[PDB]
Structure formats: C-alpha cells, structure tokens
Amino acid sequence: TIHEFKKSAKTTLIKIDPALKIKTKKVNTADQCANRCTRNKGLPFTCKAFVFDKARKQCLWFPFNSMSSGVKKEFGHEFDLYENKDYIRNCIIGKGRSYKGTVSITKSGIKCQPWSSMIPHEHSFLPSSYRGKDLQENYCRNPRGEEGGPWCFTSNPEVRYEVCDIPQCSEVE
Amino acid sequence: NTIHEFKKSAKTTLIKIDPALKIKTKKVNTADQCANRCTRNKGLPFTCKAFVFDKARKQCLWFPFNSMSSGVKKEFGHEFDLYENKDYIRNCIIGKGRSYKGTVSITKSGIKCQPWSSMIPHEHSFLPSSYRGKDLQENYCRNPRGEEGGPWCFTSNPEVRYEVCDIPQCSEV
C-alpha cells in the first residue's frame, strides 16, 4: 500500500487554517499509516496524505497535501511525508513547470536517471541548486519551463535526455 | 503485484483507429504479469499507460494510450480485461467534472461510496445504462448531470443519501 504514495523524506506539513480536520494515533510503522489512509476507515475525511513521525512512532492523517492552500512544508528529521498519488495532479499545465507527480519514464519508454546521479550522464541540475523544483528521485521534471514539458536524464548512455509523455490537462475533454 | 493499482474495465480491449500507434504483445500466464511489466515499463519502446489481458489467448497487450486517447476505441470481448494506469487518468477536475473518470470513491467526510449498480442503502435511477459516456462504474465519484456541486456519489451510509467528493480543480488561479 505504501509505492501509492509519493514519499518526501524529512518533511512534515503544518496547517494554518485550524478548521481543517486531522487525526493521529501512535502506530508501529509507516506502512500501517498507509494502510489506514488507503482504506480510509475511521477517518472523518478523505485521506490525501499522512506523515509518519519516526521518533514518537506517530501517524498523522490529513485531508490535504503540500499543494493545498494553507499548509507549509517544513524540514523535520524525524518525519516522512507521504502523499496519496490520486491528489497530486497527474497532468501538465502549459510547459509543466509545476509538475510534481511520480512519472519516471521517458516517451520512448526509458527509465529516467536520478537527479542525484551523474551516471551515465553528467549535469548541473542538482537537487540542492534549484529549490522549490522537486528534483527528487528520478521524476520527470521541467525546472526551467522549456518547450517540450517534463523530462529527465535517461538511464540509457546513448540518450542524454528525453521528454516524458505526461499529458496536458487540456488533452482530454 | 501491482495489478490492484490499475483501473479495471471488464470485457474490454482497445482498438487502433490510427494504424500509426504502437502496441507490444506477449504470451504469459496471469494478468498480474502484464501489470508488473507495465508498472516497471521494462522492454517497452514507449510509456505504458494501459494493458489488456486476453484470458483466452493468454496474452498481454501493452499500450502507450488508454480508452481516452484519440484514435482509439473500446471493443467488446468476454476474453479481455482492460487495466488503465492511474497515472494517465486525469485525477483532477475540469469545470464541474462532468468528464471526470478517476477512481476516487469516498465522499468529503470520508464515507465510502455506494455502487451505482446498487440500490442499497439508497434507491435511485442513476443506472449506468441510462448514463452512457458518464462511466458510472463501481462506486466512483461522478457528476453525470454536470451539476454545480462537482462529482458526488450515493453514500454507503443509510443516514446520508449522497455527498460531494472532494476532488481538486486542475487549474484555479
């Protein structure tokens, strides 16, 4: 069950609007958090994300994610954020600058190269340099809003980079 | 085993109008072997957005399109099951979401939706057959008449006849 979430390591979420519902429980592992979220039982809301507090072994279930108005991502070394993929927009607006989904495959079907790897291709698109852009794992991204939309470096040493095939939100009626 | 992560349409395969589009096929044992390969995208010269398992010919058919892509049509067959990769089924709403085909099946306050084909807990005349094109399948949140509220379902709570589901607008600035 865990993947169906995008994991952000060392991250939690804080609600500003205190009318947004929340539920917590001390649990054993993050997997048990995911299962409760996925099946959505005993939660008076739609579970869109949860955080696992690894220190207190606490599970925090939310009817929002990091793209919801009124919630701040924050660093915290004992937290992992998990976001339900159904609520991360899986289609691109324009050039796809704001694309944060988990597609990690190019249009000709090649598995993307992790941004934190210089094999087979070396590059100056570091996760560190480029904040807010979510150059995490091997996801298709478009950090500079360039023509063909979200892309990646390719695990194939003979294709430096290729765009992925993420649909426009305007593709289907 | 990733098969449970796809949206399943029973008794259905997909046909190419456009002869240009590409397909990969392979003889296998079970439907989850189609799923695993689609999810991993290994050996596919394209992005796998759907697959068909042919239960009579014991074949996977992997596709770089789904039932929504232009130049493709559904075809009936008792032997076929269609599995659509949720990453390529728009998970946000345009307008009132008359066209929404995602798989969210819980209401705003966390109630599991009642199946459209069911009259339990609630009786209604939103029969799938009366509402064609509107994909009133399983217990998914739908807005078959295009009303102000966005997608909704009859609720599995006898106390709550129906409720809106909480599905994000693709774009609202």
Numbering used by the authors:
A (entry chain A): 38 to 210
B (entry chain B): 37 to 209
Please share text taken word for word from the publication where this structure appeared.
In initial experiments HEPES was successfully incorporated into apo NK1 crystals by soaking and bound into the lysine-binding pocket in a mode consistent with previous results. The piperazine moiety of HEPES makes strong carbon and donor π-interactions with W188 and Y198, and weak polar interactions with E183, whereas the hydroxyl group engages the glycine loop in weak polar interactions. A HEPES molecule is bound in the pocket and shown with its carbon atoms in dark gray and its sulphur atom in yellow. Hydrogen bonds between the HEPES molecule and NK1 are represented by dashed lines. This is demonstrated, for example, by HEPES (KD = 2.4 mM) which, compared to (H)EPPS (KD = 7.0 mM) and PIPES (KD = 26.6 mM), forms stronger π-interactions to W188 an Y198, weak polar interactions to E183 and further contacts with the glycine loop. Binding constants obtained from SPR and NMR are comparable and the figures indicate that CAPS and HEPES display the highest binding affinities, whereas PIPES and CHES display the lowest. Inhibition of phosphorylation of Erk 1/2 and Akt (S473) was seen for HEPES, (H)EPPS, MES, MOPS and CAPS at the highest concentration (100 mM, lanes 4).
Two truncated forms of HGF/SF are produced by alternative splicing of the primary transcript: NK1 encodes the N domain and the first K domain (K1),16 while NK2 encodes the N, K1 and K2 domains. NK1 is a monomer in solution, but crystallises as a head-to-tail dimer and all available crystal structures of human and mouse NK1 yielded the same dimer. (c) The lysine-binding pocket of the kringle domain of NK1 is formed by a glycine loop at the top of pocket (E183 and G186), an aromatic “base” (W188) and sides (F162 and Y198), as well as a positively charged anchor at the bottom of the pocket (R197).
